[PDB]
């Protein structure tokens, strides 16, 4: 094993690889979400953009984890990437609900990894998560909750109109 | 026939002239759409602008086809231009539905011309269409589908309010 | 009829639509003229350019009339566009003679419309014509007469040489 | 199926999704290659950089395919992502040999997709591949062949020295 | 054969080499044309320049074909270059007639190569021709036809005068 | 013969034409050398570049000779261009040896032409050679000898490694 590796458990190494799979799976989900909102029969450009930007953010999260794995002397191992949970995503409301579920699963994986780092006394790992992931996730989940509340307020009234207005005046 | 003309069938030449007629007819339709939304009793400025810009795009499409006809040594022939299918265009929803129908007819004419070019082994024609028309049309039709979905979401609720909001927050 | 419409007769409205047809027909004629001078067996680039620029000017004239129709609360109605009077345009002299005939027909239509506006006491219409069309047409017809005189002086001598020289030293 | 979808076969749609999987698998392989060359006991920074930049290029290829899938009205479907073929990559020579094998498999998939597009008369697909993938792949494979020849010339002599020199004077 | 070569037939490879010979032969012809118009007893500087610039364009065409041959893994093979068809080129009219004959032979060779690429399902080759040669040739042939018409118009009248005027007012 | 021609022998005229053939033949050889080093199975980019730049230099030499031929009132005559002496060029060492042989043949042709100019008392010719060719050739041959010595020093040791290092650290 590495000439560089120091205080880096095989348990963290493996969990890191699993987290990479989760983030790339999340990126794939957002790719599918984005392109669904680009369909001529859905056509909510601002929604498409919001998800496509998240696909990039999650890929970037994976890359950051991969770089860290090499910095610590672990070995990146890639697994098959499951396709997204749906082929069609319903309304903006349905899609944002699915996004916040996804982000909470990522968040919980991050927290689990942190707890493992703390159990293994791996402060570099803890700092890495604290510095590049935990706050970003909190911020993102908050934003999603904000959106959900606004989408919900709009679409009790008259649903199509509310969906359009949200896209035009919050997302675009 | 031309000193320049090479691999340019009489069938493509004629189809090009017909496509010019279709694009100018489309430009005329958008001129009528634009000015209908400028009526004091319709008064949706952002809708007027969206259609007036399309009238310009379609005229520009025609000109591009005419320039190409001369570059290949074909002879532009102009025919009468039929007036638009309607004198009044209803709501923003009605108008966008009519626009996407129109654009799909243009798209199908483009695809037909491409197939003719491919049957005649005219790769300059194919490239010309691929480069200046097929993607533009795809993009435009997608945008229209996006708009339609947003208009529809807005105007199940309460129709006038939705029509106003769309114009103000997506189009203007 | 319009919430905006005021002092705008149905007779002017209809004449405006007819003038739009005439200007678009003129634009089509100039498109054909331009591309004829681009043939490898005609090959007078400066002549091609002079006509292609006029096609744009006439389309722009039509658009200006269409915008005005909507500003006054009239309804644009488009008709078939007749093809140009010729498929081949002869010499630069022949082509300029045909252009000045065309421009005089446009001019006379403009004057007729003005007289109708004056009979209907429609000073907005009169001003619109006076401001954006009557002087432009006068200027253009003068320029064409200038060209014709110079073309004619050149091509009594030795015709091909004169045609080349005009293109090179006046048009290009 | 889509309001936008036109001339886009289910066979191409599916092949596109498969190509996305291949490009993301390639990106994963390059992530593993990059981090292997960052190990303290391998320590060839210029090699690490060369592979890490390729991981980004392949992810970007996938994204471009996903964007195109949505533009055509197809539906992105993601599958599990297999881990890379090796956990340790040997020498720079071994690694470059594995890279060129990988790139040739991507190239052949691209060519297969093109042939399918050509069989389905899908010129947008053909152009998309021709414009954004086929030449890039050719260029890349050439570069890899160049590197391989230079690596091989260096490491018949005295292997460690050659590996160092290549990294320092070609890659860094 | 090449480590890079993929979908590149021996028939295209050979035809490419032949096209290189044709373009370099064309460059040589234009070199001779240029210098003939520089003779003290011909002395038409603008004609000399027009041909000398074409010699450069054709050499550049050859180089572009050679670069492409290497990119595809073909092997450039050079053959003897035949001298130009004439040692003296007559008038500007004679010379432009010879130029357009030459350009049409190049054009037909380009079209033949395209057809071969299409028969071999070599879309990189087709795109290469479409993108860097077919339109350039069309444009050039059109320009030559334009010149020929202007030269001919000038020199029915009084030949020396027309030849001078063309050089001074179109070419210089 | 020319209105301009003065003190320019038919012997020099003919030798100039022959030198043009030699320089274009040299340019062709360098085109083949360049593209050989671009093969995926040779892959020495810096070597490819060094030869491709020489192909341009030799074409430029030919053009300079052609311009001079016209300035003196001679008549450019082009002959077939023989293909290069090899289809594959071996190692960088083999290729540089072939290049210096070629350059010495060009140099000797230049010297022969100078001697002919001196025998014919043609000081314009002598100056032309002295000013634009003899020193360039000396400089180039010296550079090649420098390269050869460095290539040879590198590839007694361990040949592949030396070939790579030379390309990376001298050529690239
Ligand atoms: Au910790
Ligand atoms: Au085609
Ligand atoms: Au009036
Ligand atoms: Au195709
Ligand atoms: Au093809
Ligand atoms: Au001398
Ligand atoms: Cl451990
Ligand atoms: Cl799974
Ligand atoms: Cl035909
Ligand atoms: Cl009709
Ligand atoms: Cl009235
Ligand atoms: Cl009519
Ligand atoms: Cl299908
Ligand atoms: Cl697998
Ligand atoms: Cl073959
Ligand atoms: Cl021959
Ligand atoms: Cl002599
Ligand atoms: Cl020989």
Q: How many Å apart are CA F2 and CA A13, to the nearest integer? A: 85
Cβ within 8 Å, pair D7-B135: no
- Residue F163: CA count within 13 A, CB half-sphere: 27
Does the beta-carbon distance from E80 to F78 stay under 8 Å? no
> What is the Cα–Cα distance from D83 to D77, expressed in whole angstroms?
19
The length of chain B in residues reads 172
Helix (H) or strand (E) holding F119: helix F92-119
Task: List all chains that touch chain E, counting a touch as 3 or more CB pairs closer than 8 Å.
Answer: B, C, D, F
Quickly count: other Cβ atoms within 10 Å of residue E18's Cβ: 15
Neighbour count for residue F6 (Cβ, 10 Å)? 10
Contact call for B154 and A169, based on CB within 8 A? no
Buried b (16+ CB within 10 A) or exposed e, E101-125: ebbbebbebbbebbebbeebebbbb
- For residue F24, list chain E residues with Cβ-Cβ distance below 8 A: 24, 28, 81
Distance CA D152, CA D154 (A): 5
Q: Could you tell me the two tokens for E95?
A: 């010379």
- For chain A, where are the alpha helices, taking DSSP H only? 10-37, 45-71, 92-119, 123-129, 135-157, 159-166
State how far the Cα of F143 lies from the Cα of F81, in Å rounded to an integer: 27
Interface test with D, best of E1, E2, E4 (most D CBs within 10 A): E4
Measured from the alpha carbon of residue F82, the closest ligand is 18
User: Inter-chain contact D73–A21, Cβ cutoff 8 Å?
Assistant: no
Show which residues on chain C lie within 8 Å of chain E, measured between beta carbons: 38-45, 155, 157-165, 167-169, 172
Which residues have C-beta within 8 Å of that of residue D14, sequence separation ≥ 6? Answer: none
Q: Concatenated DSSP letters for A7-44?
A: S--HHHHHHHHHHHHHHHHHHHHHHHHHHHHTSTTT--
Kindly determine whether residue D138 and residue E4, on different chains, have CB atoms separated by under 8 Å.
yes
* Ligand index nearest the alpha carbon of residue E22: 16
Whole-angstrom CA distances from B57 to B47, B51, B136, E82 are 16, 10, 10, 51
- Of the residues D76, D88, D89, the best mutation for testing chain A's interface (the one with the most A CB atoms within 10 Å of its CB) is D76
Residues in E touching C158 (Cβ below 8 Å): 154-158, 162
Q: How many CB atoms lie within 10 A of CB E32?
A: 25
| C-alpha count within 13 angstroms, C-beta hemisphere, residue E125 | 28
Give CA–CA dist F9/B75, Å, rounded.
54
8 Å CB contact of F3 and E39: yes
Residues in binding site of C for Fe cation: 53, 56-57, 60, 63
Which residue of chain E comes nearest to F39, CA vs CA?
Answer: E73
Q: Nearest 5°: phi and psi at A147?
A: -60, -50
Residues across chain F: 172
Reading the block at residue A156, the tokens are 């009790």
Name the residue of chain D whose CA is nearest to B131's CA.
Answer: D127
Phi, psi dihedral angles at D66 (to 5 degrees): -65, -45
The residues that bridge with C105 in the sheet, in sequence order, are: none
Interface test with C, best of B8, B30, B64, B80 (most C CBs within 10 A): B80
Dmax (CA) for chain B in angstroms is 64
Taken in order B29, B31, B35, B37, the sign of the CA dihedral is positive
Rounded to a whole number of angstroms, the distance between the first and last alpha carbons of chain F is: 50
Q: Is A103 annotated as a binding residue?
A: no
| Cβ pair E81:F76 closer than 8 A | no
Q: Inter-chain contact C42–E150, Cβ cutoff 8 Å?
A: no
Give chain B's contact residues with E (Cβ, < 8 Å): 2-4, 6-7, 71-72, 121, 123-124, 127
Alpha-carbon gap, residue E152 to C164, rounded angstroms: 8
| Least CB–CB distance from D115: residue in E4, E6, E121 | E121
Q: Among all ligands shown, which has an atom nearest to the Cα of C18? A: 12
Contacts of C36 in chain B (CB under 8 A): 70, 75
Cα E57 off chain centre by: 7
Using CB atoms, pick whichever of B115, B130, B148 lies closest to residue D124: B130
State yes or no: chains F and D have 3 or more CB pairs below 8 A.
yes
| Alpha-carbon gap, residue E118 to E77, rounded angstroms | 23
Q: Per DSSP, what are the bridge partners of residue C120? A: none
Question: Closest Cα to residue B4, out of E62, E115, C36, E25?
Answer: C36
Interface test with A, best of D18, D55, D80 (most A CBs within 10 A): D80
Measured between CA atoms, the residue of chain C closest to residue E145 is C40
User: E83 to chain F nearest CA, in Å?
Assistant: 3
The helix (H) or strand (E) run that includes residue D100 is helix D92-119
What is the distance between the alpha carbons of residues D170 and F164, in angstroms, rounded to a whole number? 8
What is the CA angle D2-D5-D7, rounded to 5? 150
Are B141 and A39 a contacting pair at CB < 8 A? no
Count of beta carbons in the 10 Å neighbourhood of residue C1: 12
Query: How far is C-alpha F121 from the geometric centre of its chain's CA atoms?
Result: 26
The answer to whether the CB of D32 falls within 8 A of the CB of A76 is yes
A172 contacts B146? CB cut-off 8 A: no
Residue with tokens 């001074």: E168
Cα separation, A37 vs A65, whole angstroms: 29
> CA B25 to CA B16: how far, in whole Å?
14
Would you say A137 and A100 are in contact if contact means Cβ atoms under 8 Å apart?
A: no
Query: Cβ contact (<8 Å) for F43 and D146?
Result: yes
E13 among annotated binding-site residues: no
Token pair 């039509």 in the structure block, residue: C62
Chain E residue with Cα closest to D103: E4
Q: Do chain D and chain A touch with ≥3 beta carbon pairs under 8 Å?
A: yes
Give the closest ligand to the alpha carbon of residue F10.
Answer: 17
First CA to last CA distance, chain D? 50
Q: Determine the distance separating the centroid of ligand 7 and the alpha carbon of A59, expressed in angstroms.
A: 27
Contact C170, C147 (CB under 8 A): yes
In whole angstroms, what is the distance from residue B98 CA to residue B89 CA?
8
**Cα gap D98→D77, rounded to integer Å:** 28
Residue A90's H or E segment, with its range, is none
- Residue D143 Cα, gap to closest chain E Cα (Å): 10
The minimum CA-CA distance between E30 and chain D, rounded to whole Å, is: 33
**Among all ligands shown, which has an atom nearest to the Cα of D15?**
13
Choosing among E150, E152, E164, E167, which should be mutated to test the C contact, i.e. which has the most C CBs within 10 A?
Answer: E150
- CATH 3.30.360.10 for domain F1-172: no
Q: Do D142 and E4 touch (CB under 8 A)?
A: yes
Measured CA to CA, the distance from residue C68 to residue C64 in angstroms comes to 6
Q: How far is the CA of A144 from the centre of ligand 1 (A)?
A: 29
Buried b or exposed e, range A145-172, using 16+ CB within 10 angstroms: eebbebbeebbeebbbbbbbbbbbebbe
Other residues' Cβ atoms within 10 Å of the Cβ of residue C128:
20
Residues 6+ apart with CB under 8 A from B90: none
E60 annotated ligand-binding residue? yes
Q: Which candidate, B13, B10, B7, places its Cα nearest to that of B124?
A: B7
Collect all residues of chain C within an 8 Å Cβ-Cβ radius of residue E161. Answer: 161
Report resolution in angstroms.
1.8
Question: Cβ(C89)–Cβ(C36) under 8 Å?
Answer: yes
Angstroms from E151 CA to nearest CA on chain F = 24
- The token duo for F34 is 């360049």
């Amino acid at each position: 094993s590495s000439q560089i590796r120091q205080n880096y458990s095989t348990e963290v190494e493996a969990a890191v690889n699993r987290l990479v799979n989760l983030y790339l799976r999340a990126s794939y989900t957002y790719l599918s979400l984005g392109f669904y909102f680009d369909r001529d029969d859905v056509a909510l450009e601002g929604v498409c953009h919001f998800f496509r930007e998240l696909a990039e953010e999650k890929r970037e999260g994976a890359e950051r984890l991969l770089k860290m794995q090499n910095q610590r002397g672990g070995r990146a191992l890639f697994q098959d990437l499951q396709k997204p949970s749906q082929d069609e995503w319903g309304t903006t409301l349905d899609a944002m609900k699915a996004a916040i579920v996804l982000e909470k699963s990522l968040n919980q994986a991050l927290l689990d990894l942190h707890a493992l780092g703390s159990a293994q006394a791996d402060p570099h790992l803890c700092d890495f998560l604290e510095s590049h992931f935990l706050d970003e996730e909190v911020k993102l989940i908050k934003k999603m909750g904000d959106h959900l509340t606004n989408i919900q307020r709009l679409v009790g009234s008259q649903a199509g109109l509310g969906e359009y207005l949200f896209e035009r005046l919050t997302l675009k």
